[PDB]
Ligand binder design. Sequence first.
Ligand SMILES: [Zn+2]
Ligand SMILES: [Zn+2]
Length: 83
Amino acid sequence: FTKHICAICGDRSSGKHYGVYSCEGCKGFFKRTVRKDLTYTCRDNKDCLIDKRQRNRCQYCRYQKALAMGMKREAVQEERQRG
Ligand SMILES: [Zn+2]
Ligand SMILES: [Zn+2]
């Protein structure tokens, strides 16, 4: 968005992580998740009420949101390019 709020949780973004305005928690979290190629769950339905309140504890839903917008998953493998 104009004001670079974190596309996922509405936090202040640090940069366009994986091509989308994102915050530090999300930066690392998404990287970890993708590199490991993990999946999670939350104590809510898939349509979890994602807002500022939902800290990075809400891994699953943050990941769903990231995927929904379409964070450039592949870019996570940058450091994995051990040429
Ligand atoms: Zn975030
Ligand atoms: Zn959730």
